[PDB]
């Protein structure tokens, strides 16, 4: 009853980006591992550097197998992302709680009917505040983007007075198409 593994709906790949000024952005970009069970997810997560312990300029990306963590990818080019910008913390370490929660929404297929629209999530650790975002395939699918948004905010425990925004990738490349 707990000896058998619990398979996820999708196979996910964890990517890591090291901001080493030696080779194109799409270079320091590396795939760390893939997993398709709850057990294997934890075996990876419990054994990799916490986001709060990553140095400035690095990112972690959890994306569905077959979707590279880049705007240009076929599943991201017409899509966008729900973006949360966070303050840096000399203590607290809340960045880890937010990222893990995000990971749980992705692997647990928390977006029901619209989990297929989800492409992945990215956490950027930067000197001026960190960022967490959930990428989706079509920035046009209003119902899907919007549902994913509401569920996510709730899951992050964000209050009614806060609101978060969704920006198209084509826009981030060149405001929010949605807000929840």
């Amino acid at each position: 009853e707990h000896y058998i593994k619990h398979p996820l709906q999708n196979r996910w790949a964890l990517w890591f980006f090291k901001n080493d000024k030696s080779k194109t952005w799409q270079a320091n970009l590396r795939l760390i591992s893939k997993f398709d069970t709850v057990e294997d997810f934890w075996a990876l997560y419990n054994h990799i550097q916490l986001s709060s312990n990553l140095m400035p300029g690095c990112d972690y990306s959890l994306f569905k197998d077959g979707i590279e963590p880049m705007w240009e990818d076929e599943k991201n080019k017409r899509g966008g992302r729900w973006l949360i910008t966070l303050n840096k913390q000399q203590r607290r370490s809340d960045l880890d709680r937010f990222w893990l929660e995000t990971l749980l929404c992705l692997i647990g297929e928390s977006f029901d009917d619209y989990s297929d629209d989800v492409c992945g999530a990215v956490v950027n650790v930067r000197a001026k505040g960190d960022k967490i975002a959930i990428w989706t395939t079509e920035c046009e699918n209003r119902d899907a983007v919007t549902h994913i948004g509401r569920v996510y905010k709730e899951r992050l425990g964000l209050p009614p007075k806060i609101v978060i925004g969704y920006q198209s990738h084509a826009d981030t490349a060149t405001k929010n198409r949605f807000v929840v």
């Binding site: 619990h6 709850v38 997810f41 692997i107 899951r155």
Partner: peptide, 14 residues
């Protein structure tokens, strides 16, 4: 195959 947050967390340290 969906999974509740609480369910997923029960597997982190077993």
């Amino acid at each position: 195959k969906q999974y509740d947050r609480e369910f997923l967390l029960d597997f982190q340290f077993m």
